[PDB]
Amino acid sequence: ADGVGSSSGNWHCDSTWLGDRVITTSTRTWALPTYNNHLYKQISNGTSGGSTNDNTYFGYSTPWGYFDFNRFHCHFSPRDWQRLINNNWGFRPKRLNFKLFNIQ
Amino acid sequence: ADGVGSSSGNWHCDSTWLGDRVITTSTRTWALPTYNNHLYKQISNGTSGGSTNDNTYFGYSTPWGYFDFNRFHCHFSPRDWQRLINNNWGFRPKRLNFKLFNIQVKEVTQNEGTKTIANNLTSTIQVFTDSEYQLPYVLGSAHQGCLPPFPADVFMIPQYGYLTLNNGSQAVGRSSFYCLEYFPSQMLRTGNNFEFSYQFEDVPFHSSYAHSQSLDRLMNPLIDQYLYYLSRTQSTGGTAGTQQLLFSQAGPNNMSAQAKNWLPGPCYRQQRVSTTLSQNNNSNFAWTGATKYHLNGRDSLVNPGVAMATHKDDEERFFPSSGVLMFGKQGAGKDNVDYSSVMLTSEEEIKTTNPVATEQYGVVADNLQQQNAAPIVGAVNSQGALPGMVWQNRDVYLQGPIWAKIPHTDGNFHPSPLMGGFGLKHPPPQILIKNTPVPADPPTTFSQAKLASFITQYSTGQVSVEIEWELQKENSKRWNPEIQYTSNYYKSTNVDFAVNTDGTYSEPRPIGTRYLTRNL
Amino acid sequence: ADGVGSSSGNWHCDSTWLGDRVITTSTRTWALPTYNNHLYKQISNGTSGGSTNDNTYFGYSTPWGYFDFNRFHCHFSPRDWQRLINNNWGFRPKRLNFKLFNIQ
Amino acid sequence: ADGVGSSSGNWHCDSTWLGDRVITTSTRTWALPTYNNHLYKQISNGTSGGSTNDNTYFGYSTPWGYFDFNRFHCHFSPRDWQRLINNNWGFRPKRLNFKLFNIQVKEVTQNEGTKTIANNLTSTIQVFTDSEYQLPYVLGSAHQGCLPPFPADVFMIPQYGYLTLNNGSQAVGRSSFYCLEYFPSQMLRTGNNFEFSYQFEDVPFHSSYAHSQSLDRLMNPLIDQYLYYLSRTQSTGGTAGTQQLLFSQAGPNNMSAQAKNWLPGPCYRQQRVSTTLSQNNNSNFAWTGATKYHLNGRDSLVNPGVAMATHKDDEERFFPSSGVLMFGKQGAGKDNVDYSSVMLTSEEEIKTTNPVATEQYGVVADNLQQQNAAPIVGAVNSQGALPGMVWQNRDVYLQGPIWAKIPHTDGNFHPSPLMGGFGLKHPPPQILIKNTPVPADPPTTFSQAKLASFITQYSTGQVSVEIEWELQKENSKRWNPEIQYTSNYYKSTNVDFAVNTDGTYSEPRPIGTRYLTRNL
Numbered sequence A, C: 001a002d003g004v005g006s007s008s009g010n011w012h013c014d015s016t017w018l019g020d021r022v023i024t025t026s027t028r029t030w031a032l033p034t035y036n037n038h039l040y041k042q043i044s045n046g047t048s049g050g051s052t053n054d055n056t057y058f059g060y061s062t063p064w065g066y067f068d069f070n071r072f073h074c075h076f077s078p079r080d081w082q083r084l085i086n087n088n089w090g091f092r093p094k095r096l097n098f099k100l101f102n103i104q
Numbered sequence B, D: 001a002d003g004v005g006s007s008s009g010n011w012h013c014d015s016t017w018l019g020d021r022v023i024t025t026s027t028r029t030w031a032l033p034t035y036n037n038h039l040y041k042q043i044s045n046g047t048s049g050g051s052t053n054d055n056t057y058f059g060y061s062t063p064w065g066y067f068d069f070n071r072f073h074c075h076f077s078p079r080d081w082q083r084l085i086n087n088n089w090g091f092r093p094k095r096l097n098f099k100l101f102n103i104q105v106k107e108v109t110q111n112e113g114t115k116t117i118a119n120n121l122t123s124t125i126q127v128f129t130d131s132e133y134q135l136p137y138v139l140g141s142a143h144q145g146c147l148p149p150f151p152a153d154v155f156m157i158p159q160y161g162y163l164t165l166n167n168g169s170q171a172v173g174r175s176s177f178y179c180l181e182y183f184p185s186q187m188l189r190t191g192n193n194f195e196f197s198y199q200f201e202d203v204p205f206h207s208s209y210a211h212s213q214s215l216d217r218l219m220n221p222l223i224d225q226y227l228y229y230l231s232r233t234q235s236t237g238g239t240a241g242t243q244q245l246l247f248s249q250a251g252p253n254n255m256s257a258q259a260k261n262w263l264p265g266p267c268y269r270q271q272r273v274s275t276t277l278s279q280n281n282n283s284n285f286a287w288t289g290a291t292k293y294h295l296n297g298r299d300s301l302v303n304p305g306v307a308m309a310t311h312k313d314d315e316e317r318f319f320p321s322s323g324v325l326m327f328g329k330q331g332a333g334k335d336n337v338d339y340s341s342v343m344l345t346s347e348e349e350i351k352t353t354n355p356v357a358t359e360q361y362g363v364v365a366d367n368l369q370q371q372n373a374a375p376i377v378g379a380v381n382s383q384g385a386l387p388g389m390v391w392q393n394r395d396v397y398l399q400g401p402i403w404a405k406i407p408h409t410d411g412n413f414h415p416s417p418l419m420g421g422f423g424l425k426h427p428p429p430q431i432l433i434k435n436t437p438v439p440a441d442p443p444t445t446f447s448q449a450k451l452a453s454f455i456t457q458y459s460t461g462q463v464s465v466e467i468e469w470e471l472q473k474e475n476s477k478r479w480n481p482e483i484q485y486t487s488n489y490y491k492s493t494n495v496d497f498a499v500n501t502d503g504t505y506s507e508p509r510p511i512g513t514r515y516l517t518r519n520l
């Protein structure tokens, strides 16, 4: 069972090269602050200031944060990238699996 | 189930002597700090400074720490070592079992000048083993930081770093960088425990015994040999010295001339240093007159060197300069400490099969004789392996290393460590451990820069390592009593191998493993 | 059945990379002359001539010829050698198969 | 069993018309020489000579030859082509079958001035196919060397070479070298035969038909549209021209103003050249005024270009400079041959859905109007694809290529060849063939140098290629008679599509595939 005195999961970083599949995995440690003092806030930029008409926007900034893994260097070491680009014509993602654990 | 209020495991220290097995176990308490503020750091030393070309290095120092149990005194009490070396010809490890348990993790903070420490229940630690030997193997270099010899001491886990190819202080193209967070590891909170098992690959018994016969004396003292040797090349007793070839059978009278099947082990000479000071030369020859090997433009002192007898008969005072292992007495400084502080080990017992470290291997001819030219025989300082050659490995000690990792290479010759030990192609996996970093409060506005501010933290806990040793029982028909390792009978200020008035454990002398005799 | 009007075998050159095996094959065209007019001949070199004592030999030269494939470049294209040395720590031969065919 | 005295296969030429399938087959006799004296040779052309930067290349010419059947006239007699184009809307290939048989191999020698040729029974040939498309695919570039149109001719197999990345005449790092002996191939003596089967990937029917409606006339001529357009921006009939917006429904009166769902196909303009000479300008604009595309610093003429109508109504004499395929009449020189020798193909039938090659695609506005500024409308010379746009592919011809290989790339837009044909991602494998070299007598003393002296040799034999075509039958309610392809009724000096007095077969005119009509 879960508790304050038992870890939620384990650290994992690997590249498993098997046949035509390569399974890359990465684990990181993150810190999530409190944004906007827990407020949604209208944010906007008008042409009234030094801004031009091209740079104007209207939107909202939330308290919520989000994870972005969308860059390759997250999932590949420079060596794992070298095996990839040297030996292979093409690659495409199949499936991903995502985990939060060990929350302080 | 695990929890903050239940212990992970139990304390165990024993030696279980059963038949041909002895299972030794040890438990210690450790404290693992935070190294490098959770940073990998290039470290290097160039010749630009006062350093020479020999002392240059390039490498990385990690945050990770590691356990080193590689010394014998970790697994044996001085009494358990005495049962071992007195009653047994040989021993080799079979399997080991290793445990982390009872993990406390504590955050320490500074307020003005006062320090305070408090449990952090939710913090973790990361522990993996390299089973596939995919890391620089840092054990077997005889570094400090082993579990204490005495079970009541708490020890500090050493930092893990490694060295890589260099040119000067600069790195070459084949230099490798290993990120240790890139392995799978297990993360443990205060209720979790870590364990794994390991099984040693079959390895020849360390031979603990001395030969009761020297190598050249294997002959029968009573009987002559049917072989002949060339005794005299010149006419004897005649008024003219006209040469004539005369032959003789060797016998009890001249044994040095008999034909022999075997030759002493290989010889790579050392410089001779006398403990009596007035005998040694006046100069500093320690580095200059040293026996060195030259590898890639760097002269590396040869230490301890190939196994070779320390000194010949009735010379106690001489020892090879780099030839012998040297252990310090308790509380010995690290720099230019006097002779009285170190404990010099000595090999008496390999004099039979091995040459003396400080003397020539032998003598060979330098020329082809003629009626005109006299024969000239040169000395052999260095001798590699020859067919029909036998030698003994260096003796293991209670303070010395247990094993070393045989490098992975195309070829090797008699792969046994020169420090003594068990050469292993797949030694016990080295166990890496680190405190998982906990960030200090991040800013309220996002910034890409990585978080450099962490909570000061350290973890403590209990570690158990249990090795199963296989014994080779002594079976011998010797009539007269053996030499044994015995503690001193006469009174002493304080007991040997025991704590002093102030609580400091100390080992008085190095204890070699070979008191028993065999026939060569 | 064999005959003057049917080929004995087929041309084959490949490198088949499968798992931990690589099967390399090579086919060449050879021409075998008639040596020594079908004679065994003593051949020797003495120190009598300008030769020194180190260069002297005694032996026989036969009519027979022989095949030597013993060099790597016979069995690997420079690309097949590149796949080999870049991706792999070690290699050792397992078995070979050898053929003469299409004899004119 | 095979042997020197039994034939490998039989002659076959037919067209089997059954239902929706037509199986056409052809057999020819070929002669394959020895190219490059059995050598691979770097070939290149630099700008150092009179060449320009556009004409530079780097590549290799091999000994290997190859079969090219890629032209229609190989697989169809002019009558079989007439049944096809008259009775059928569309056709696409299904599968082909290919055979080598009846192989003679002959060695020729020179003695003084007299030549003699004699069978070599033991010599072989090497034939492989690239099934996996691991070679430069040299077919589809409309090179010469196809099987003759007329079955009685013997043809010479063309040499195989390929081009690779270059910078000037020099080769860059990504330049590839392909050794063709490095594939598995089959070696055939005079009794052996070679065969393989191939099955075309599903491909849209080539559309052989013309539209009976222009694209803009799809409207009902009787009825008005309920939509309105802006007819007049100015007050009409008044003494003052003060602007007023006035709207109107388009109808039979003004059709050009109606709202339409679809737009003509894309336009990339060509220069207009008139067959009547006095109308064309006096200068050489052929290269200078040409429509070119600029790729990697090299200007490459756009030929034939995107499918676009040759000329508009009641202009016969104008044709786009590079826009049309151009075939030569029998016995036409390769350099600066007069207009009367070439046969210009023309697209009449795509005028409905496609823009004229020599005129603008349309007109768009160049400015935002104001009371101060007058509206200015610019011409659109080049127009890419827009939504709601329809076009016809270029018409295949009896002399033209059947297919081309769709390059392997991340993306393509409507991958159909601009020469016309069937774009295929995996076209028929190109078949390579070579004479296995036979050495001339080697020296009697060994020498490492490769053997440069070979027996002069060549091989001949029979080749059969059989393609199964799928037909799309014409089903139409049209009342009045179609246009058909008909041979001339009036008397002639010699029959069209038949041999002349001297034995030379000739094709009088290119025969386009679309005589039938459909509704657009």
Ligand SMILES: OC[C@H]1O[C@@H](O)[C@H](O)[C@@H](O)[C@H]1O
Residues within 6 Å of the ligand: B052, B054, B055, B286, B287, B288
């Ligand atoms: O000056 C004596 C010193 O010489 C150096 O070359 C060496 O690094 C030291 O170990 C010591 O031998």
Ligand SMILES: OC[C@H]1O[C@@H](O)[C@H](O)[C@@H](O)[C@H]1O
Residues within 6 Å of the ligand: D052, D054, D055, D286, D287, D288
């Ligand atoms: O001088 C006219 C020539 O100009 C060159 O640039 C071109 O290679 C030729 O095709 C021809 O156009």
